[PDB]
Each structure stands twice: as structure tokens, then as C-alpha cells.
Amino acid sequence: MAEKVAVLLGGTSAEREVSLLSGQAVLAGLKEAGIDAYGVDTKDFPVTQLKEQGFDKVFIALHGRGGEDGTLQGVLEFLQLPYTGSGVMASALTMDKLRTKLVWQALGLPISPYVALNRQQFETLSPEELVACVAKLGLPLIVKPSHEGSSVGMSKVDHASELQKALVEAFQHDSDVLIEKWLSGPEFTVAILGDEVLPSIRIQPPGVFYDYDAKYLSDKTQYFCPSGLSDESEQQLAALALQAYHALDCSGWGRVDVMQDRDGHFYLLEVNTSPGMTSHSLVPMAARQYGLSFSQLVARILMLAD
Amino acid sequence: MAEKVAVLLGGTSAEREVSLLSGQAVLAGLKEAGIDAYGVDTKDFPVTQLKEQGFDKVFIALHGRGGEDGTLQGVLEFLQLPYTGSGVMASALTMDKLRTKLVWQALGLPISPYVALNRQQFETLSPEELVACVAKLGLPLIVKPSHESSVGMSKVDHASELQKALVEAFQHDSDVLIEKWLSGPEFTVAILGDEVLPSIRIQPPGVFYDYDAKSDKTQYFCPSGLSDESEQQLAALALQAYHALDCSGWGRVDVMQDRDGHFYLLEVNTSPGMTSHSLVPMAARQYGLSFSQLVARILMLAD
Numbered sequence A: 001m002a003e004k005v006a007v008l009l010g011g012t013s014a015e016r017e018v019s020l021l022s023g024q025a026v027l028a029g030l031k032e033a034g035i036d037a038y039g040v041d042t043k044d045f046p047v048t049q050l051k052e053q054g055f056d057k058v059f060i061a062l063h064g065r066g067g068e069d070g071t072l073q074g075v076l077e078f079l080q081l082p083y084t085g086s087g088v089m090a091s092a093l094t095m096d097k098l099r100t101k102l103v104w105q106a107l108g109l110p111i112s113p114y115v116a117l118n119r120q121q122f123e124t125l126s127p128e129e130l131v132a133c134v135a136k137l138g139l140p141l142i143v144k145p146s147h148e149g150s151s152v153g154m155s156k157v158d159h160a161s162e163l164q165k166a167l168v169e170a171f172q173h174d175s176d177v178l179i180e181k182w183l184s185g186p187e188f189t190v191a192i193l194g195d196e197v198l199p200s201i202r203i204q205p206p207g208v209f210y211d212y213d214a215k216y217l218s219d220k221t222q223y224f225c226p227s228g229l230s231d232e233s234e235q236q237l238a239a240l241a242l243q244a245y246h247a248l249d250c251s252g253w254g255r256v257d258v259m260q261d262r263d264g265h266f267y268l269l270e271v272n273t274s275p276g277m278t279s280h281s282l283v284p285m286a287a288r289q290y291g292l293s294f295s296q297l298v299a300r301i302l303m304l305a306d
Numbered sequence B: 001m002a003e004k005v006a007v008l009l010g011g012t013s014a015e016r017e018v019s020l021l022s023g024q025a026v027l028a029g030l031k032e033a034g035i036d037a038y039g040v041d042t043k044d045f046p047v048t049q050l051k052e053q054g055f056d057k058v059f060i061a062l063h064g065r066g067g068e069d070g071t072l073q074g075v076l077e078f079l080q081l082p083y084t085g086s087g088v089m090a091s092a093l094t095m096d097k098l099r100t101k102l103v104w105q106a107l108g109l110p111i112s113p114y115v116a117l118n119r120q121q122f123e124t125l126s127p128e129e130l131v132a133c134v135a136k137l138g139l140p141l142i143v144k145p146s147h148e149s150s151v152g153m154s155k156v157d158h159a160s161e162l163q164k165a166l167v168e169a170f171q172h173d174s175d176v177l178i179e180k181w182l183s184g185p186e187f188t189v190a191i192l193g194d195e196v197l198p199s200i201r202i203q204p205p206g207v208f209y210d211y212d213a214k215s216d217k218t219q220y221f222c223p224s225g226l227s228d229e230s231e232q233q234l235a236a237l238a239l240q241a242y243h244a245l246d247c248s249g250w251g252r253v254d255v256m257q258d259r260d261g262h263f264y265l266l267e268v269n270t271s272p273g274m275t276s277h278s279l280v281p282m283a284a285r286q287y288g289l290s291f292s293q294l295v296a297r298i299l300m301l302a303d
Ligand SMILES: Nc1ncnc2c1ncn2[C@@H]1O[C@H](COP(=O)(O)O)[C@@H](O)[C@H]1O
Pocket: A097, A112, A142, A144, A180, A181, A182, A183, A184, A187, A205, A208, A209, A210, A211, A257, A269, A270
């Protein structure tokens, strides 16, 4: 019989409202393609019952916790249902910004100079020792929790005297914290669809961070596709992005986040393994510039689930 | 109302028979400690219904696929049931010999000199170019799939044997590793929470400690023969390796020495065997734990 496809949407993360909109858009595009798709709001329906309900394949339009972090991927693996996007390991690994950075560094891929600190060091070290620990990074600094957490707990530290309060804030959210040399920007994202690298997008957040307000709420964020990069720089960025995505064992689709420093060198930030899928979200924008309609995009993502 | 504990055992992986034994043992030990535990053969009972069935906490005594690789951990995270051993990421990461190696490498942890090949490379490059890729490693070499001790491993003694090995490895995975051969001896270090248990020296019948080994020629030595000072160095290295991969609860770290007596990290196993002939129970005996104490302490680390 024809495949019955579940579009997982909404859920219970902070990104619920955006996921409802992703899932709505995905459903309409699947419908336009003639795919027998059904919206499943996982706040109300347990994912562990999908095989029992008669689904054959899963389109993941969830964002954040319980959607893009390996938990859901593990449930679908247990159910033996094919599903979109990256597998368990890559989905979880991409949430862990420390271990993402370790993998990339071992491979020789570029990341901003940084220092990692765990809670037992933080409790053991004085403020002045903590300042000395990061002095090699210069000023300003970015301090963040190591794990992805809807953008929370990050600070830009302009003076050494401010480090302590930034560490206290970050350690409210995670027991590993990262202190990074500040990158000037600009910021970019590079969508990946199976083998294919899509046109980059330049991202201009309204504030210091491309955070939850910037990504999902504000109209002040600006995006540029094409990005403005030269052909030679676009080629270099594309190859870098694909290397970063493979480094983490990603598959199906995703997006790689990159920033430049003052001299134009690219640095890798992270990979998003369940990107927004509203009609004007990044991946649909990159895909339209590449030549795919929204419908074709979601059909392709789904064809890559096997 | 005492907590009701499921001991997940058997399942459907290649390791099912071993897992039945591990599970049987675990179940007996938990009950011996006063825990209200039940055996649950996951071949017959779906892990998705554990909460519906009234279970409060889970001891995972499954091995291999669907047991120690993150998939089960994802289901138990969804159900919000506390469980033994490492979480989703560490459980999955520890299956990937490549990305394990990369994490350890970036932290400055000791691993055998190696060269990683992806498939683009195998199929592009000619047999002579591939010999040349790994020249700097010398001889002899081990060739292995990045996932799965199972199939696909070779020992390569001359450059001319390499192609054959790369072909056997690439039947099984698209990241393949070529490493400098380490002389041994080989050791394993069980970790229980924060505590490192006494090391075990492992003498396999042949070249690999690999399943047939995990024969009845396989020999284990505990004490391992290391000095107190080396045991301390090993214990610290092992803990660092385990924490590097985000492991928790318990597990086993596999390490080898080289010709200069330095230790090199091999892998971390996140759901170890618990049979009468298994390594973690032997280390636990050596530390002065009963098997019942051992399993209760592992369960106590689940919350
Ligand atoms: N080292 C850095 N320097 C400047 N901006 C950063 C840095 N790290 C993160 N950001 C900003 O914070 C956002 C979220 O950080 P992250 O989740 O680490 O990518 C990025 O998309 C950037 O806008």
C-alpha cells in the first residue's frame, strides 16, 4: 500500500509554536506532492505509538528538546520506522557544543579559540584564577552553556571583572560552560540536503547573539541569499560546511552555522539537525535560491529517509 | 510502596544469549539486596510499555544493538524512567570508534597513531596510493570498521596485504580505521560511578580480543601485574577517557600498552557483560564487592 507518513509537530519544547508552523507548512507541501501525510502533535500523541497507529515513515518537524537531540531518534530506531534527518548519535552530539568542538578540532576544522570549564573547576578556582585561565583569549569573550538550550545563559564579557557573573549565569543551565574568543562576524548558515550543499545565507541579528528572539520572533533580523560572498569564498564555505556536517555523522539534511572573524577566515559554530520549516525559514530560503520549490524540498527530505 | 525495577534482558541482538545470562545474574543480585526487581525479556515485551506496566526504574542488562547504543536510552528518556548506565549521546558515541578517537585526541588523551579513510577516498585512490596514505604508520597495522570487534578487522603484516583488509573492512562501514599495531598487554578497567575498580589484564587466544575471545584459552589476570603507581596512572587515564565521552553510571574502559609501556585508549563499553565469566564481576570481586552489592550500587546511580 502507499506509505502513510506522520509529520511530528508541536511537542513540548520551548520551540513549540515555531514547530506547529513548521509542521503546518510541511503538511501542506507533502499534500501538494501527493504524499499521504498526517499531522501528529506530539504534545497529545505519544511517539512510542506511531507504528501501532499504522505509520510507515516519519517526517520530524519538531525543534529543540525531545525533537532534535537523539531521544526521539532512539524511539523511531526502536520502532524500526524510517525517519527524516540525522540519526541518534549525530542528533545528540550536535547538542553538545564541547564535544562538537573536540571532534572538529581533532580534524583540523576551524573553531574560535576557547576554554572549557566544568562546575568542579568553577567551585575550586577563585575569580582571579578564572580570569587568568582565559587571558589568552583576550577581550571581549562569549560565555555560554556547553549544551544547546534554546539560546539561554549566554553573555558577552567586555571586561575581566564581568567574567564571574557571566560564569555564574551560564552554570545555572549546565555543568560544562565554554568561554570563547569573540568573533566579529558576519554570520552565515549553509543548508545541506543529502549530498548537496545549498546557497549560503548571511545572517544579521539585531543584537549581539543569533538567539531565540532573532531566529523566531523579531522582524529586525535580516537575511541575505545570495550571501554576498565571492564565488571563491562560497566554494570554500561549501566544502567547509560539508566537512563539518560529515564530521558529526549527520545525514538526510540540516544546516551548518559559521561565522567570520575580522580577517575573513571562517569558523564553525554548530550544526542544526532539525531546522525550521516555515515558508520563510532558512532552509526553505536556501532551497528556493537553489531552484527547489517548498514542495520539492519536503519531498526530497522525505525520500532521503529510508 | 517499594520501587518496582525492570531488569531488561535478552532482546534481539547477536549478544542475546550472553544478555540472558547477564540479566539472570543481575535480577538475582538485585533481589538479594532487597530490591523489588523483575526480569523483562525484551524480545517478548516492548520496552515502550514499561511505564504502563508500573515500573519505576530500569537496569539495562542488554548488549549490542538496541541495548548499548543509545536507541533504548532514547525510549527510556521519552518515558522519563530512570535507568542504569550512560545516556543517549555517550551510549551512541561509544559505538563509533572514529569519533571516540577524535574526542580523545583533541583532549590530548593517548591513542594509537592512525589514519582515517572515508569511502570517497577508498574508491578514488589506487592500491599503491592507499599504501602510501598509511606509510607513516609503519608495520604491522590493524584495519577495522569504525563501527563493530565483530566482523571486518584485519592484522596487516606487509603493505601488499592492506588492500584485501580494506576490502574486508569496507563491507561493513564507510569510515574505516588503520592504526599502528600496539604490542600489549591489554587491560580493562571497570568504572562504577566515580570509583575505578581493579584493572584486569586480558590475554586473548589470538590477535584480537573479539567475542570468541569475549575460546576457553582466553585468560584474565587480576591483579593485573601493574605496579601501584601504574595502576594509579591507568585509573586516572581511564576515568578521564570515560568522562571525555560523557559516560555515567558504570562502564568498562579498554586500554593497551605499547612497546614503551605507555597506555593507549581503545574503547568504552557502556553496557558490560555480567555473566559468571565476565570482566566487570571479576573486578568487583577483586574490590571486595559481592555481585549483589555490585548491581545494587549500579542501580543506586540511576535516578
Ligand atoms: N564566539 C562567538 N563570537 C561571536 N558571536 C557568537 C560566538 N558564539 C556564538 N555567537 C553568537 O551566538 C549565537 C548562538 O551561539 P551558538 O549556539 O554557540 O552557535 C550564534 O549564532 C552567534 O550569533
